[PDB]
Design a protein around this ligand. Structure first.
Ligand SMILES: [Zn+2]
Ligand SMILES: [Zn+2]
Ligand SMILES: [Zn+2]
Ligand SMILES: [Zn+2]
Ligand SMILES: [Zn+2]
Ligand SMILES: [Zn+2]
Ligand SMILES: [Zn+2]
Ligand SMILES: [Zn+2]
Ligand SMILES: [Zn+2]
Ligand SMILES: [Zn+2]
Ligand SMILES: [Zn+2]
Ligand SMILES: [Zn+2]
Lengths: 143, 143, 143, 143, 143, 143
């Protein structure tokens, strides 16, 4: 059982905690192969959730949640734990907004399981910032 | 100057470093009267800026920059410096996503200078999450 | 999955990285619902492992590895990450020394999956040191 | 008065705090010639001690205590202070178990005052891990 | 608006908080262009001040205050935030005492706005310690 | 030895590393019974010392060294290690500036061995700032 799997497996698990059916996504922040922070698709803590009270639409989607990736980053900021020089495992490739946050934060590698459309600017930023992104299936597992 | 005047002064001050024609924003994160992190309208560090190579519009908005509020938080993350129970001073009241991010980060007060129409969800959130928001102008300052 | 199910899941998960034929153990140190450190049946990092060069028996026990519980704590030490008032999830209940180490480290709960005969001194200790110990199975998990 | 002495002297002092006559041993963890953690031969804190209630035998010795070396390491884990890249001063060379812990922790040098039998595996591990161990008498001192 | 200005401007602002008219001086400790600590001319916190109760003379001056520079350093020590490898912006060049403290602390650059007489020993120490000091006017600013 | 005896012992111990003929001082900063930082009569690290090149008198006092009390605090600053709510053990009671620095740093007790005439302002301060000061001799110690 490799770290990539151990990590990519944790993402899929955490993504199940998404508090808004519109999207199940999980993210894990690793440093020295050590999980430091995690996140899934959910809104502010101690706040209603698209699950209990239904979505919070605004011409389109339940804007109620904070993206998993972002949530992971916020966990570092709230818990005061450095994210610079880390890598990340995400169920889906980050949207353009998160991609900028992750990079700004100092994340040096994006490991996704799947991805609809990777924003071209994402790719540009990643290139300029010299950050690699790699697909990596979710390992099938035991009891 | 008062503490508020000193902080809001910095908000207005740091916003001047913005690298995007379209907006000059500045955020100051404070904990126990100490500026711990800041932010302004800027893109990912070490990447082109709407300033040097021009904007990256897409739908009518140079999507290059990262909101000051966020950058201030990202800075916290990136440096392991905690933003739990902090207070923010911003030139303009946060958009709905920054609001979420900020509350999720653990900030308990948002002291703004300018403000359009605070999003309804913003208040629903600040209300539930018991965060207070106050207006305060930029003290006129000497040298 | 429940929080317990997510943690005990990782315990069982990380134990798979063990490098010693004779035992597959996995420890997950948790603080405020965040996995902060982990461990599995492994020897010193960057040294031969019962896996590659075979066991180092002496009296009938490959003494190469370090107990998962410990490695999880050592990881805490090595990274300056605190283990005070944390909670541990382990595949098998701690031997008497790990029990001591864990309590001395400041963990207040030991959630195990499997358990032989908890040492009497173990209970004397957990009792005095007011640490609680709970059993919980590994949730059956998908992909 | 050299640091080696200042440190080796502190070990002998702390070793006097051993809470079990069966063995008086002290240990000091240094980083940048700065004491970061210490330990002596004693059991879990806020627990009985071979001193007050007599030993806790198990076909041999009072298993009641945690080895000084280990205790020092635990202090880092409990207090959340990094031990990686540190050196150590111990009244006696570590047993094979502690030797593995210290190495795992990232201790880069063992300074002992005395030593019965250094486990061969200890020497092997230390070699593989490129860690030096040196004997160093205890300086005689003043008032 | 350059960082030198942003920083030198903050010093002049903080210097206005001096709680003893005999001297208005402010200091800012920067690391990675990030303010980490600050200080002005004032006495121990939660103590009287040459402002409210008049000076505390001793054949010369109100010894009641702690120099701004020193206060900044103390803020790091009290708040537990590393000052090694930082630079500093001060309204006035440090006296010989502070100069030694700053250097000991690990401050690698002194940026002053003005300076009466720079103690020769200061210059010597700075040279031996390879630390540069630079004058830098205070930028004139807005509302 | 008692805890006090162990700490005051170190104070007297570390003062022996002083590099200035004229005074041998030693400060031990303690938090929850752990020596966290120390100091002795020494100049800036990596600079000539009254010991090697002779004193730097000016008005009759080798102004080279930095007071032990301070160096202990500077060490705290330089290493990000907090000195809030700590306790200090010193060979000689602090001069008025160190007293200020120490209180401002957040230490709540000053356990000295020797003491000339405590400055009046020192008491005014320790009184207001509710810091207690105690005398205690250096325990006679063996090897
Ligand atoms: Zn939803
Ligand atoms: Zn996103
Ligand atoms: Zn633009
Ligand atoms: Zn925004
Ligand atoms: Zn084996
Ligand atoms: Zn064990
Ligand atoms: Zn015993
Ligand atoms: Zn041992
Ligand atoms: Zn005054
Ligand atoms: Zn000064
Ligand atoms: Zn001298
Ligand atoms: Zn002094």
């Amino acid at each position: 059982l490799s770290w990539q799997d151990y990590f990519m497996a944790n993402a899929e698990l955490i993504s199940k905690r998404s508090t808004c059916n519109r999207a199940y996504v999980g993210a894990v922040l690793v440093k020295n192969n050590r999980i430091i922070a995690t996140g899934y698709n959910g809104g502010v803590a101690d706040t209603d959730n698209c699950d209990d009270v239904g979505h919070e639409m605004e011409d389109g989607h339940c804007i109620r949640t904070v993206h998993a990736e972002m949530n992971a980053l916020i966990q570092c900021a709230k818990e005061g734990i450095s994210a610079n020089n880390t890598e990340i495992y995400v169920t889906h490739f980050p949207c353009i907004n998160c991609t900028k946050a992750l990079l700004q934060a100092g994340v040096k590698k994006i490991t996704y399981n799947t991805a609809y459309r990777i924003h071209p600017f994402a790719i540009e930023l990643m290139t300029q910032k010299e950050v690699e992104y790699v697909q990596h299936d979710v390992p099938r597992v035991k009891l």
